[PDB]
């Protein structure tokens, strides 16, 4: 009493879309379309480290800070049309929960409903991209630091 | 899919770094060189372009080398001695290639050899690619 | 009149007679092989076709050699061991060339070498021709 043939057609189409989306982003060119993040042709920036220890002992551990994001976003040329950024939801959550010395936020300072819906027109969030935090297990207070060379976000 | 491009656009070696090989071009109506660097250079290496013609003893063996003349283009000036030459610049990286071709045919054979055979000349390779078959 | 064929169809040395050179096919979407003889043969020389993955320590260096697998066509038998191989027969004259190719790409680098190194093997030359680029 159910249309199993139509269900299978829909399932096959859904699988095709899901695989195509992973391709064009990470696929290699041997049997799948080559993705931009795998080709790695876009110029890259490298976040500055931090000496978390003492001046007498330079530790130079990796770190990520809000003004690094600000510099990255403001460094894009204005000639190249209208830019849009792509990133991961965990990264957005990490970015939106930073606080200054007085304990108040510094992104969406006075908003009680800050959410990706507000900035949807400049920032695109998809969970298929690499996640530097690895399920909120790195970068926080008391946790192991980030891993050098990790992907954070791309703009183009 | 991928094709059998060697059927229509064959290529032959011309300078493997120690010896030159005359290449017959009579059966094809176009051609061009292709330079590659296998290790970083130390100084500019100039190349000389020669051409041969059928020997008297055997019509299928090239004769002695003859230096190809120059044909000035409408927006340039002739070379000092009026003979063609090729110069590979110092800035060529190990991971890049160059391509250039002569404007005229002259004889049915051709070859390319360096001006001086030294340690820098061994760092280059030259190949000739045909295009179009008249038979 | 004449064309700079080397811009669209670059070719690279693969087997100069004494050494094997990896060739990067990643930047081009099709390729082929071209075999030529420089002296008379005495016994059939079989060749092995390989491919290399990217090296772990440096992404711009090829890794270890891996042997290409076989892919049967519509109707036909697979190789005895399932791998790809090429054989140059005795009848080939010094004035002719043979062309071939592989139906599938696999790794980004490609290579070729004889099964054995001897007097007969050193008399052959192999070159790889690329078709239009994609970068």
């Amino acid at each position: 009493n159910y249309d199993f043939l139509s269900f299978m057609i829909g399932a096959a189409q859904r699988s095709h879309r899901i695989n195509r989306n992973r391709a064009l982003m990470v696929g290699d060119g041997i049997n799948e379309p080559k993705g931009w993040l795998k080709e790695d042709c876009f110029p890259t920036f490298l976040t500055l480290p931090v000496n978390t220890g003492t001046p007498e002992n330079p530790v130079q551990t990796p770190a990520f800070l809000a003004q690094d994001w600000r510099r990255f976003v403001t460094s894009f040329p204005a000639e190249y049309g209208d830019a849009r950024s792509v990133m991961h939801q965990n990264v957005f959550g990490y970015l939106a929960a930073m606080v200054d010395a007085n304990g108040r936020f510094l992104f969406g300072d006075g908003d009680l409903t800050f959410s990706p819906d507000l900035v949807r027109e400049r920032i695109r969030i998809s969970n298929c991209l690499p996640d530097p935090t690895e399920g909120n297990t790195k970068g926080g207070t008391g946790q192991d630091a980030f891993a050098a060379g990790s992907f954070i976000a791309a703009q183009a | 899919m991928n094709f059998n491009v060697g059927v229509d656009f064959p290529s032959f070696i011309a300078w493997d770094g120690t010896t030159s090989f005359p290449v017959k071009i009579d059966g094809f109506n176009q051609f061009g060189f292709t330079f590659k660097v296998i290790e970083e250079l130390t100084a500019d290496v100039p190349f000389n372009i020669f051409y041969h013609e059928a020997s008297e003893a055997d019509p299928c063996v090239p004769g002695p080398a003859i230096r190809v003349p120059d044909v000035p283009f409408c927006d340039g000036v002739a070379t000092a001695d009026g003979l063609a030459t090729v110069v590979i610049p110092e800035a060529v990286a190990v991971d890049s290639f160059c391509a250039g071709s002569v404007p005229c045919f002259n004889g049915p054979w051709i070859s390319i050899a360096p001006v001086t055979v030294n340690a820098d000349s061994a760092k280059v390779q030259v190949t000739v690619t045909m295009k179009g078959a008249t038979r | 009149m004449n064309f700079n064929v080397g811009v669209d169809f670059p070719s690279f040395i693969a087997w100069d007679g004494t050494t094997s050179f990896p060739v990067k096919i990643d930047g081009f979407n099709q390729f082929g092989f071209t075999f030529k003889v420089i002296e008379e043969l005495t016994a059939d020389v079989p060749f092995n076709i390989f491919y290399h993955e990217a090296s772990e320590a440096d992404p711009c260096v090829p890794g270890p050699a891996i042997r290409v697998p076989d892919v049967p066509f519509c109707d036909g038998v697979a190789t005895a061991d399932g791998l790809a191989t090429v054989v140059i027969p005795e009848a080939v004259a010094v004035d002719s060339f043979c062309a071939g190719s592989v139906p599938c790409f696999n790794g980004p680098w490609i290579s070729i070498a004889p099964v054995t190194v001897n007097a007969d093997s050193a008399k052959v030359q192999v070159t790889v021709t690329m078709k239009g680029a994609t970068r």
Partner: peptide
């Protein structure tokens, strides 16, 4: 005379030239 056409590299950047962003401005 011959004019050589050459392409940047076989790879876009065999070793990608990543660069540190411009340093901090001031206090």
């Amino acid at each position: 005379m011959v004019s050589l056409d050459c392409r940047n590299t076989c790879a876009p950047a065999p070793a990608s030239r990543l660069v540190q962003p411009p340093c901090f401005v001031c206090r």
